[PDB]
């Protein structure tokens, strides 16, 4: 089951009962997750900019006729945390740890709650939610999110898609220690069905397996 706006900028796939996966094209895609709950709905970063991040938000709320109230930010670069403004405006609270909050402000980008802990559990009705912040990789302060009613992984931009031989930006990144970082996620969640990358197709655990071939 997949929706799509007449553009084809924006499409929201199901991956099972309350679980979404939204992905938006900046032609870069963007992966990102929309949790229907019953008090609302929760989504896993928004989108580019604040434009495709609105239309997102629009297009969810029309289909579950209920609001947007949380969004964690798990990085502080535009596919992650582009419709900042956007959210603010709306009373959407932006969760995030506090490094990406001083490292959205030094983006040009509004700040972010900086709430978020080494690990911190959400619970949003009946759907549980957890952030884990592994170390450096991608970007100094990439977290990824766990669903653990589902052992769904959000590996954000830690971690690559199937088909992809590029690291992406390796700018802003740390290389060396990008390994080190993924293998804290492989040692601290042992049995992961799904694993959703930060651009590409739904995998498994492969796909950390892959990105840790990929950084060799
Ligand atoms: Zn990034």
């Given at each position: 089951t997949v929706i799509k706006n007449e553009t084809g900028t924006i499409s929201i796939s199901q991956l099972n009962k309350n679980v979404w996966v939204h992905t938006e094209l900046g032609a870069v895609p963007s992966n990102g997750l929309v949790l229907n709950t019953s008090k609302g709905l929760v989504l896993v970063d928004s989108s580019w900019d604040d434009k495709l991040t609105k239309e997102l938000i629009e297009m969810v709320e029309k289909k579950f006729?209920?609001?947007?109230?949380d969004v964690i930010i798990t990085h502080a670069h535009a596919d992650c945390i582009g419709g900042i403004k956007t959210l603010k405006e709306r009373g959407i609270k932006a969760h995030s740890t506090a490094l990406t909050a001083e490292l959205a402000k030094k983006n040009g980008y509004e700040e972010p709650l900086?709430?978020?802990?080494?690990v911190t559990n959400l619970k949003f009705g009946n759907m549980k939610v957890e952030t884990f912040y592994?170390?450096?990789?991608?970007?100094?302060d990439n977290i990824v999110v766990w669903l653990p009613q589902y052992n769904?992984?959000?590996?954000?931009?830690l971690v690559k898609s199937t088909s992809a031989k590029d690291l992406g930006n390796?700018?802003?990144?740390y290389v060396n220690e990008w390994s080190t970082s993924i293998e804290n996620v492989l040692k601290r969640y042992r049995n992961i069905n799904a694993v959703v990358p930060g651009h590409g197709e739904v995998g498994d655990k492969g796909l950390l397996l892959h990105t840790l071939d990929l950084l060799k």
């Open positions: 006729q209920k609001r947007v109230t900086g709430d978020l802990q080494t592994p170390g450096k990789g991608h970007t100094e769904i992984l959000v590996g954000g931009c390796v700018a802003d990144a």
